[PDB]
Design a protein around this ligand. Structure first.
Ligand SMILES: Cn1nccc1C(=O)NCc1cccs1
Length: 284
């Protein structure tokens, strides 16, 4: 079926939970043996969220190459994304090592450091220009260059230096700051505006390594971001945009990381975002 009318048909029939459970039943199951080794327990935020072995990002290190991060490679859309958990106190150096080694231009953050009165990820970037951060375990230096605070998101320019070679690179930090502590946003308008700002920066384009996207577990809000982006790109590429099947795209992405889209409310929000986004693209 088309998307917008499949949408109203699920609303009128109140069957979002049943649709979402079907997706969960059909999703791929692949091994995640490296994630479950005992030496990696303090590298995982949640015991039930792990990268598959076949798609995990490897650190360029001979001691321990493990990070909780996955490469989502979308062949028809010609887009790739790295989805990862919010960094932990003992993995902030690994996180920036990955950004460096994978040649990423941008980092997309969809959570606040504290939500619901608890810490959802480490404070992994510097908050003042004159107070830079040094990660001694991976030999990197990170400096805040500029910060632009808007009503729904903040954009930061960061300098990442590899202290071993003295090479430097500019990294863009796109921080969506207004996702509610409970539920999903009422309107997708500010989330779509944010996605378009990430696109306009070049961070999603083929001349750079894959964008790094995270929330707390790296599967819920993070899944919504890449699902909406890929679906809109396919609607632009195909002769028949109504052929794009958001459930099929989501199942394809779940071949690369488990659990993408965590609730039926996030599934409905993803439909809403793609539907509204397709009108603004045109041609309107
Ligand atoms: C050390 N350890 N033993 C078992 C599990 C862990 C662990 O590091 N878990 C992740 C988190 C640490 C602190 C906040 S979340």
């Amino acid at each position: 079926m088309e998307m917008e009318k499949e949408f109203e048909q699920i609303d009128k029939s109140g069957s979002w939970a049943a649709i979402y459970q079907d997706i969960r039943h059909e999703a791929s199951d692949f091994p995640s043996r490296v994630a479950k080794l005992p030496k990696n327990k303090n590298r995982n935020r949640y015991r039930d969220v792990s990268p598959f072995d076949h798609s995990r990002i490897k650190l360029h290190q001979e001691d321990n190459d493990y990070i909780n991060a996955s490469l989502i490679k979308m062949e028809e859309a010609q887009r790739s994304y790295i989805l990862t958990q919010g960094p932990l106190p003992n993995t902030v150096g690994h996180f920036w090592e990955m950004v460096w080694e994978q040649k990423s231009r941008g980092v997309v953050m969809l959570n606040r450091v504290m939500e619901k009165g608890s810490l959802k990820c480490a404070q992994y970037w510097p908050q003042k220009e004159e107070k830079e951060m040094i990660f001694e375990d991976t030999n990197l230096k990170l400096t805040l260059i500029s910060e632009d605070i808007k009503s729904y998101y903040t954009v930061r320019q960061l300098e990442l230096e590899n202290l071993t070679t003295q090479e430097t690179r500019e990294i863009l930090h796109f921080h969506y700051t207004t996702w509610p502590d409970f539920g999903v946003p009422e309107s997708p308008a500010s989330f779509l505006n944010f996605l378009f700002k990430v696109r306009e920066s070049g961070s999603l384009s083929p001349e750079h390594g894959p964008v790094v996207v995270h929330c707390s577990a790296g599967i819920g809000r993070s899944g919504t971001f890449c699902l909406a982006d890929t679906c809109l790109l396919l609607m632009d590429k195909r002769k028949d945009p109504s052929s794009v099947d958001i459930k099929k795209v989501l199942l394809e992405m779940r071949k690369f990381r488990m659990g993408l889209i965590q609730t039926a409310d996030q599934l409905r929000f993803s439909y809403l975002a793609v539907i509204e986004g397709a009108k603004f693209i045109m041609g309107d």
